[PDB]
Q: What sequence folds into this?
């Protein structure tokens, strides 16, 4: 039970079917191998090797399907011993395009703005969704999960951005979600350009 490794995803936890995302299993505890597991699956998926001085191993999930949705963990080990590290923190991976119903991403004012404008891009759907995820073709770190409201025979959720800055003007996407299927997401909506 050594220092657990860290599991990150590039560029995000949301992957479309037939696509690829890479997982990084790294540590500063100087491991020389890492093993990737999927929570609730007996055999490990992959096993690699590294070189510390920190050490790292990349795992790639090739052309993904619905069944790739779930929780992943990795372990680190040293050269000689068979002692494997403590489990890493669980990585949630979600799969897009897994519902019949589709969602639409609109914008309250317009796609074109000068700084200080309050924009409120919307995410709608005729089909039932519990939560809507807002994401950005951006650099890093986490989708924005809001809960849905049934407005005008149409489920939706407003995403306030308030006073806008240059750091905002990227590419957007929203998804629909149901809690019965945690790691499954609706088809992405069309990109919205700011």
A:
């Amino acid at each position: 039970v050594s220092k657990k490794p860290s599991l990150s995803v590039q560029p995000g936890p949301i992957v479309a079917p037939e696509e690829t995302l890479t997982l990084q299993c790294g540590s500063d505890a100087g491991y020389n191998r890492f093993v990737l597991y999927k929570d609730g699956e007996r055999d490990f998926l992959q096993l690699a090797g590294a070189q510390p001085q920190l050490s790292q191993a990349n795992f790639t999930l090739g052309p993904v399907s619905r069944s790739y949705g779930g929780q992943y963990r990795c372990y680190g080990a040293h050269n000689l011993s068979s002692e494997w590290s403590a489990p890493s923190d669980p990585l949630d991976i979600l799969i897009a395009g897994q519902f019949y119903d589709r969602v639409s991403l609109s914008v309250q004012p317009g796609p074109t703005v000068a700084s200080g404008e309050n924009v409120t891009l919307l995410c709608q759907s005729q089909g039932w969704m519990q939560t809507f995820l807002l994401t950005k073709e951006g650099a890093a770190d986490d989708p924005w999960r809001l809960r849905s409201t049934y407005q005008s025979q149409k489920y939706q959720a407003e995403f306030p951005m308030g006073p806008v800055t240059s750091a905002h003007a990227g590419t957007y996407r929203c998804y629909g979600s149901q809690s019965s299927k945690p790691y499954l997401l609706t088809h992405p909506s069309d990109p919205l350009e700011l």
About this structure: The chain has two domains: 1-96, 97-194. Residues 70 and 95 are 9 Å apart (CA to CA). The domain at 1-96 is CATH 2.60.40.10 (Immunoglobulin-like).
